[PDB]
Write a protein that binds this ligand. Structure first.
Ligand SMILES: *C(=O)[C@@H](NC(=O)/C(=N/O)c1nsc(N)n1)[C@@H]1NC(C(=O)O)=C(CC2=CCN([C@@H]3CCNC3)C2=O)CS1
Ligand SMILES: [Zn+2]
Length: 828
């Protein structure tokens, strides 16, 4: 009884346009039984056919399967296992010296700094943490049980075959012991160059099947020349034949890359998982997006063949329809490619609705994210991340150059350089001035009269720390006489400060409406901003659960009131808590749809072989936000309409056919993006700081030793005070006593963090004038972004659009995408 693999199902748009599909290639297959067949001859024709075959392909310039885990880089023998380990570490700036356990938790500490995982995620069973990494699209090739790398277990087990119980480490030596193993029996009168072409084919065939099975593939795509060449020379090359094997293709390439996902090799760290699930070794599996989400559905139903006699025919995978409109997704992808392009070296944003001039460097931004949802039912109509990818690079499965060289980037700033990262579900950001409608919604529900106005000072002093409108921080801060509508309209932080705190702050604290942070954070929770969006079981979503009330207490003690200055920040978007575009989308959508919390969906329907369908996304929860008076939202949209026509977004929308509600979020630079190596950065610019390098190293090294001496002593003094405890168990004391004899040598960590902390210290001593800014002068700018959130047509809404350009500074950058995606939707 032999398994047949079903044709993989198709992924289509809401209207039936193909996004993921199949296409047939011509493959070379070798039957390991037939080539190793022996009878009267002393030796199998296996080795000769392997050589013949290859030499044929290398003549036709044809790419072949090479998984043989010893390669020669310019006459030097090396393990591929050994190479993949260090390639992984350098992939995300991990120190080579770092072991399996410290290489894993290092990846964790990065993603935790990037907001993808939380601090409570680290204090967590390591398999549940590998699950969280795995769920977000991270696959560290690390077995958490024995704290070792797959490549090592894989090397030991690969050497175990050919009965090499030697374990003596030598790539040059190992190459031989296998070459003349009882199992291979390769003739010695052949050079290790042509003798290695042999092993590629034999070692492959050996690995895939131990129990007799069906053929193995040695070329996945081969041209007309090498087809007819291998049919006519069939009797010469017994075992070698031409089959057809289907492959994954995405005709629109990079379109909806992140929602769609990719198929590729089964991830090394759970091959046993997939083999008990009934998978072959030579098998492609969805590893991201809907491809993985619906792996079981799209994989279809295996049909056996008897052991030719064809018994049970397979059943093709249900066709899965997304909620994405291709037409709109196209505009959304093209939009964001364009803003990043035109923003670099300057240009014009070309728009159906009026092209705009743009000059360079106002952002210096590499990334972008945008989402568009149906506000009634939470169906996602378009979802674009930049950087993105071609799912096709993976169909065949390149796993060295295209994968390594371009699929990650600088690991000390991954949000702006991870093409596999869906910034829309997985990238959290400080919501800027788009939070304001949450603050205003809280104030309204706690009595606020929208028409109440203030003579805007444009700045609030709180002991020579000044919280001011941007219009103040750049001149005289005044929005003159200012009610809620003008506050939302021109984005007055002073108005929001006053309503968020429930008191008139420049002149004491009174107001008479009773509003605090807890009430704002309440209205955060009500708009589902501490909640997963609905996409998490369909695509990669960063979990949105925010720290609990009792979980925040327990880390404080091992107070809980809100400062005025903090409340001020929280009111206007600045805050501990950061949120993803898809999260905001639900929040703005709730304004647009009259106070309903829609659960987002990307998978619409599946359609079986018998052309019947089912609606996957009709379980989705719509839920009446428990507002005191939902008519309060109509004052938000009254505000957000003025933003479009007269406000912060008139540049884009003022001369736009459709009534658009909108709010802009924008934040300026606040520091610098760290390097992958501080220490070397400081060495590279030692001259530029007017400091001798040798001297600075010799001093930094001195300053360290002096901190150690200091730590060492204060250690000795603690052990000795501890030893004066009258009643101390003898084992306890035998430990402390044995430290003082051989130990009392405290050492610093030897990190980039530590060794570079001390070098910067040495620099400032030998240049007593230089500033941190001047030292950090060469680094990229951190802490800037622009949000545009909008919904339309404002007076009877249908669609919400959220757009973010991180490291961007001009709200033009976010507005114009939003404006295209809304324009397109309404059929203009
Ligand atoms: C809302 O987002 C408000 N922003 C801020 O308070 C911040 N200033 O730094 C902030 N919040 S969180 C963080 N890290 N920083 C006000 N609204 C906005 C808006 O809605 O657009 C304005 C900013 C403004 C517009 C144009 N800007 C750049 C300089 C001029 N050309 C580009 C710009 O910063 C006012 S702040
Ligand atoms: Zn103001």
């Amino acid at each position: 009884k032999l398994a047949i693999e079903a044709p993989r199902g198709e992924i289509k748009d809401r209207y039936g346009r193909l996004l993921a599909g199949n296409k047939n290639l011509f493959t070379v297959q070798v039957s390991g039984n037939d080539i190793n067949k022996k009878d009267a001859n002393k030796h199998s024709r296996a080795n000769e056919i392997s050589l013949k075959l290859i030499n044929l392909l290398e003549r036709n310039g044809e790419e072949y399967v090479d998984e043989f885990p010893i390669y020669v880089e310019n006459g030097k023998y090396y393990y591929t296992y050994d190479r993949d380990i260090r390639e992984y570490k350098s992939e995300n700036g991990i120190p080579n010296d770092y072991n399996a356990k410290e290489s894993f938790y290092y990846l964790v500490d990065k993603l935790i700094s990037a907001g993808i995982l939380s601090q409570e995620d680290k204090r967590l069973d390591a398999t549940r943490l590998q699950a969280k990494l795995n769920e977000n699209g991270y696959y560290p090739p690390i077995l958490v049980s024995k704290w070792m790398f797959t490549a090592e277990r894989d090397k030991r087990d690969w050497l175990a075959s050919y009965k090499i119980k030697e374990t003596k480490l030598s790539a040059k030596e190992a190459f031989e012991k296998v070459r003349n193993s009882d199992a291979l029996e390769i003739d010695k009168s052949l050079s290790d160059e042509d003798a290695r072409k042999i092993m590629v084919v034999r070692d492959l065939i050996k690995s895939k099947g131990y129990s007799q099975y069906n053929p193995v593939t040695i070329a996945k795509d081969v041209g007309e020349t090498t087809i007819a060449q291998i049919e006519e020379s069939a009797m010469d090359l017994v075992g070698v034949s031409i089959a057809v094997e289907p492959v994954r293709y995405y005709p629109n390439g990079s379109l909806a890359s992140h929602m769609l996902g990719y198929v590729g090799k089964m991830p090394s760290t759970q091959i046993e998982s997939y083999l008990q699930k009934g998978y072959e070794t030579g098998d492609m599996v969805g590893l991201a997006g809907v491809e993985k989400s619906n792996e079981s559905r799209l994989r279809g139903t295996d049909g056996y063949k008897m052991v030719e006699i064809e018994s049970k025919k397979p059943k093709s995978g249900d066709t899965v329809y997304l909620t994405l409109d291709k037409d709109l997704q196209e505009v959304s992808d093209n939009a964001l490619k364009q803003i990043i392009e035109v923003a670099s070296k300057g240009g014009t944003f070309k728009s159906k609705f009026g092209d705009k001039p743009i000059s360079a460097y106002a952002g210096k931004a590499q990334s972008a994210a945008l989402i568009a949802i149906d506000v009634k039912n939470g169906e996602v109509l378009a979802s674009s991340s930049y950087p993105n990818y071609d799912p096709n690079k993976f169909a065949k499965g390149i796993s060295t150059e295209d994968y390594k060289a371009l699929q990650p980037k600088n690991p000390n700033d991954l949000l702006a350089g991870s093409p596999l990262l869906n910034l829309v579900t997985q990238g959290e950001f400080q919501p800027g001035s788009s939070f304001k409608m949450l603050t205003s919604m809280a104030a309204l529900e706690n009595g606020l009269d929208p028409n109440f106005t203030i003579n805007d000072p444009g700045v609030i002093m709180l002991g020579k720390k000044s919280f001011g409108d941007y219009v103040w921080n750049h001149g005289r801060g005044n929005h003159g006489m200012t009610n809620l509508y003008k506050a939302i309209q021109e984005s007055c932080n002073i108005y929001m400060a006053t309503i968020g705190t429930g008191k008139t702050w420049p002149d004491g604290k009174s107001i008479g409406i009773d509003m605090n942070a807890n009430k704002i954070l309440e209205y955060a929770k009500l708009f589902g901003l501490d909640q997963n969006t609905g996409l998490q079981d369909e695509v990669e979503e960063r979990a949105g659960k925010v720290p609990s009330t009792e979980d925040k207490l327990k880390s404080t003690q091992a107070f809980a009131k809100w400062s005025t200055a903090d409340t001020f920040n929280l009111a206007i978007g600045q805050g501990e808590n950061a949120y993803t575009p898809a999260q905001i989308s639900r929040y703005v959508a709730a304004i647009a749809n009259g106070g309903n919390l829609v659960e987002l969906s990307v998978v619409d329907r599946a359609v079986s072989s018998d052309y019947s369908s089912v609606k996957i996304n009709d379980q989705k929860k719509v839920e009446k936000i428990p507002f005191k008076n939902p008519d309060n939202l109509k004052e938000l949209t009254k505000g957000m309409k003025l933003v479009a026509r007269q406000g912060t977004a008139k540049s884009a929308f003022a001369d736009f056919p459709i009534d658009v509600a909108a709010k802009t979020g924008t934040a300026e630079k606040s520091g610098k993006i760290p390097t992958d190596n501080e220490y070397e950065y400081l060495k590279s610019h030692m001259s530029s700081y007017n400091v001798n390098l040798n001297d600075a190293i010799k001093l930094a090294d001195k300053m360290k030793a002096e901190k150690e001496k200091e730590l060492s002593l204060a250690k000795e003094k603690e052990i000795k005070k501890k030893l004066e405890n009258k009643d101390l168990k003898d084992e306890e004391r035998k430990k402390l006593e044995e430290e003082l004899e051989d130990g009392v040598k405290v050492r610093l960590e030897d990190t980039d963090k530590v060794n570079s902390s001390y070098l910067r210290k040495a620099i400032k001593e030998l240049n007593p004038k230089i500033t941190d800014d001047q030292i950090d002068r060469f680094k990229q700018d951190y802490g800037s972004f622009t949000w545009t959130v909008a919904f339309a047509p404002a007076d009877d809404p249908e669609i919400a659009v959220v757009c973010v350009i991180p490291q961007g500074d001009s709200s033009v950058f976010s507005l114009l995408p939003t404006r295209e995606v809304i324009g397109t939707y309404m059929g203009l």
